[PDB]
Amino acid sequence: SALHWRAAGAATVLLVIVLLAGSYLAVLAERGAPGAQLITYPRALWWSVETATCVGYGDLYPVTLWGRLVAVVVMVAGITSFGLVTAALATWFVGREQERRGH
């Protein structure tokens, strides 16, 4: 298995870990803030996914400093992870095309 594919897999497992810890930590950070909605684990997990993918419907979001800091980590982990898959796909195509060109 080439590096890029290995890194892709690793990036994926790591994202899953960030999502779960992010969901757990968001609840921990947000409970105690009057008005917060990111306070139960099931929807927090959903919030973590739509944040990692940067969709951000706006149905749920953190209102506290630490909830927001946790959100930033999730955003960056998602962007980085998917960005890394793109780079792996590019490498795959670059390699295949170099062969097809007989180089």
């Epitope: 757990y24 609840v27 921990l28 947000e30 409970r31 105690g32 803030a33 009057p34 008005g35 917060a36 909605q37 306070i39 139960t40 684990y41 099931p42």
Partner: antibody, heavy 118, light 106 residues
Framework: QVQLQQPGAELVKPGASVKLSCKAS????????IHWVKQRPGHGLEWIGE????????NYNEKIQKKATLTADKSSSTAFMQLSSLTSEDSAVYYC???????????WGAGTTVTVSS | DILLTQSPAILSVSPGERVSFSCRAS??????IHWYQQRTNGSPRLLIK???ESISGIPSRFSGSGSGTDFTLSINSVESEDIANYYC?????????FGSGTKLEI
């Protein structure tokens, strides 16, 4: 089997403090929160606060005067609530309840009747 | 903080009739409402979670409905054992809050 065990009663002198206990059994998850609810005779249910034993973080009802301090003991699976400097206004049944982090109180304790008197 | 209004405070019904308890939230809370039954000198007991989802061990005559700001707890054919106080509770926003409760008289 009873998931939450609470002592039946506690007599407290005005001004004094008491530490109520809530021993939990059954399934325990890192996502569990133990809540405390106050119910005065003839009145409804009033939320006091909550605590997540897996982390030790506690939040309290901001609308009422803070009389409690929540702690938890992971090894003995027990949650505690320290009520301090009580008055007759603190006389009531205090229930502990378990929430799986999904918003509802699936199980409640039998409740401890606290009487503040001389 | 979300105010939960339970009115009327007391509901009288004849044995066997269908009864409905009202719970109105001060703002929209989706379906994050839960219902509890508390009999004289007993501790609260979960009846319905998330507005309409049934709980195991609870008689089938118990059901809930509604979304947004208005919710209903219904009992199909009330019987003596249903005599108690009924409370709604919200978990949409922090902090969780409870309604004032409605008593069922037969």
């Amino acid at each position: 089997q009873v998931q939450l065990q609470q002592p039946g009663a506690e007599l407290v002198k005005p001004g004094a403090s008491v530490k109520l206990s809530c021993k939990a059994s059954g399934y325990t998850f890192t996502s569990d929160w133990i809540h405390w609810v106050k119910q005065r005779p003839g009145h409804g249910l009033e939320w006091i606060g909550e605590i997540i034993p897996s982390y030790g973080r506690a939040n309290y009802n901001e609308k009422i005067q803070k009389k409690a301090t929540l702690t938890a003991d992971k090894s003995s699976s027990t949650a505690f609530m320290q009520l301090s400097s009580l008055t007759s206004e603190d006389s009531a049944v205090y229930y502990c309840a378990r929430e799986r982090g999904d918003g509802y109180f699936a199980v409640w304790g039998a409740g401890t009747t606290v009487t503040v008197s001389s | 903080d979300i105010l939960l209004t339970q009115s009327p405070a007391i509901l009288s019904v004849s044995p066997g009739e269908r009864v409905s308890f009202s719970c109105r939230a001060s703002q929209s809370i989706g379906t994050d409402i839960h219902w509890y039954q508390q009999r004289t000198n007993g501790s609260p007991r979960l009846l319905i979670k998330y507005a309409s989802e049934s709980i195991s061990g609870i008689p089938s005559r118990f059901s809930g409905s509604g979304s947004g700001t208005d919710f209903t707890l219904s009992i199909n054919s009330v019987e003596s054992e249903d005599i108690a106080n009924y409370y709604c509770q919200q978990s949409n926003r922090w902090p969780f809050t409870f309604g004032s409760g409605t008593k069922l008289e037969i």
